[PDB]
Amino acid sequence: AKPQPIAAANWKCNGTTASIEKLVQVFNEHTISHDVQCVVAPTFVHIPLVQAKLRNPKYVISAQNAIAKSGAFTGEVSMPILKDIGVHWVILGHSERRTYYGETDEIVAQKVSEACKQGFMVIACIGETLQQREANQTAKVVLSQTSAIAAKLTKDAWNQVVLAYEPVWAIGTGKVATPEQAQEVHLLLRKWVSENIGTDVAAKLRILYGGSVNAANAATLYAKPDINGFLVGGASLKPEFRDIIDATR
Amino acid sequence: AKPQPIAAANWKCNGTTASIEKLVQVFNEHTISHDVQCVVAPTFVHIPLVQAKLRNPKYVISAQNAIAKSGAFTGEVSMPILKDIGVHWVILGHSERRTYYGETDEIVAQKVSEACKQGFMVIACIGETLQQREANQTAKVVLSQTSAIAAKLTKDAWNQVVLAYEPVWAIGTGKVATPEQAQEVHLLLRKWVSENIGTDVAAKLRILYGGSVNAANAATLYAKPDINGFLVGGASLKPEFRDIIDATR
Numbered sequence A, B: 001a002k003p004q005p006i007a008a009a010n011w012k013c014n015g016t017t018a019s020i021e022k023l024v025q026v027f028n029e030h031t032i033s034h035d036v037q038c039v040v041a042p043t044f045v046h047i048p049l050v051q052a053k054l055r056n057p058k059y060v061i062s063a064q065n066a067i068a069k070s071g072a073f074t075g076e077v078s079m080p081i082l083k084d085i086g087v088h089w090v091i092l093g094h095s096e097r098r099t100y101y102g103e104t105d106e107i108v109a110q111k112v113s114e115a116c117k118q119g120f121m122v123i124a125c126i127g128e129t130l131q132q133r134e135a136n137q138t139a140k141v142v143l144s145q146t147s148a149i150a151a152k153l154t155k156d157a158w159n160q161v162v163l164a165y166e167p168v169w170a171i172g173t174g175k176v177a178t179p180e181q182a183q184e185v186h187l188l189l190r191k192w193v194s195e196n197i198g199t200d201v202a203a204k205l206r207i208l209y210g211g212s213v214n215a216a217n218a219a220t221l222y223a224k225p226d227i228n229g230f231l232v233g234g235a236s237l238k239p240e241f242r243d244i245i246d247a248t249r
């Protein structure tokens, strides 16, 4: 049987106090009656507002990024700082960060390791580019990204790890991976985890799909045996995030 | 006569809710009786706490960094987002950001321009490295950084601009620039602004010194004719920030 599903909202760099208050009320009023971990990741400056207004018992609050240690890092937010204000989830290795803000496989793996050490639940993002997929390098790429992370983790740290398979070509492009495309990658990821980390770890591991998930395509994606939920960008800013949660029933 | 001084606290990536509540109480209880703009720049996640607790009428709250536009920028905080939550000051071009997070002269100038367009007061950071100073390139460097910013600004936008001369070698090193060293650079900066932007702009422009400022060295720095206050790192996390404010009397 599948482990507990996750429906995660990456709001990215979006929102006003008014829009967030309205959307959070929508999320609060949506009564969820199955076992699912909902996650909302607002911008750093919006974290306290969401903490103050979000009351739905199925939800936790996540950061969109973090650095490992406090200190002389102007503009950045550290893991101890998040922990202190009551945020113990974090998204790491998200694609535009990897691509434009210099987060290499090594850097992402290090961040994931430090977050686990500091008691975070981590949504670690992996995924191939359009060119990588065309060159039939999808498996090589996601396994390389996963193994980099794994190399810095103890077996027991995996209880805190959630993988998000998010092909770069599906992010905000209106071109969702098909259920067959997504399942194929989830299956190979779980096999690798089973063989390299443990059969027990593999059985409990949530592997989420991300990239153009919406209310209409979510259920058929979730029907696949190795998809454990979603990392949602655009649609998570809208009332249809309710439908995506319910698609994990 | 000197324009209104500024005493600005860059807390960098530091603080807990408990430490911030204590330090803000210290700042609140310190009664300031001269004309000065105090500025506190906490981490993004701490902005609402500081907004809720800081009451000293001489203070405004600043962001430590921002990007210009909202959108698909995981982990980042935009200028419209800050404006909406009531933050209309921002520090830009701070040294570790220039050096490690890829913020070139062009990128910093663009950020400053967008912040001004969005109605921000901007503390724009400039300054030479140790090697640059040894090679007698200080003037060339700070003028190049300043001119890059100036090229993207209308004359009227300068009413929103505060320059912070912050030599890289003086940041957190316990090696403050001497009053003579700082004044020499402030004088040449103001001359450039006078000649290139306008005599009126130059007279009103706040040029702050940053780099190992503390309670003991602040007054003698402020005594120099072209120093208009301070951008303070380490000492701004301590009760002695009160003394630094009072050193602008």
Ligand SMILES: *CC(=O)COP(=O)(O)O
Pocket (backbone or CB within 6 Å): A010, A166, A170, A171, A172, A173, A210, A211, A212, A213, A231, A232, A233, A234, A235
């Ligand atoms: C995971 C992610 O970045 C999704 O973005 P979307 O707008 O394609 O859902």
Ligand SMILES: *CC(=O)COP(=O)(O)O
Pocket (backbone or CB within 6 Å): B010, B166, B170, B171, B172, B173, B210, B211, B212, B213, B231, B232, B233, B234, B235
């Ligand atoms: C401006 C700045 O980064 C100062 O740091 P400090 O700890 O040297 O004051």
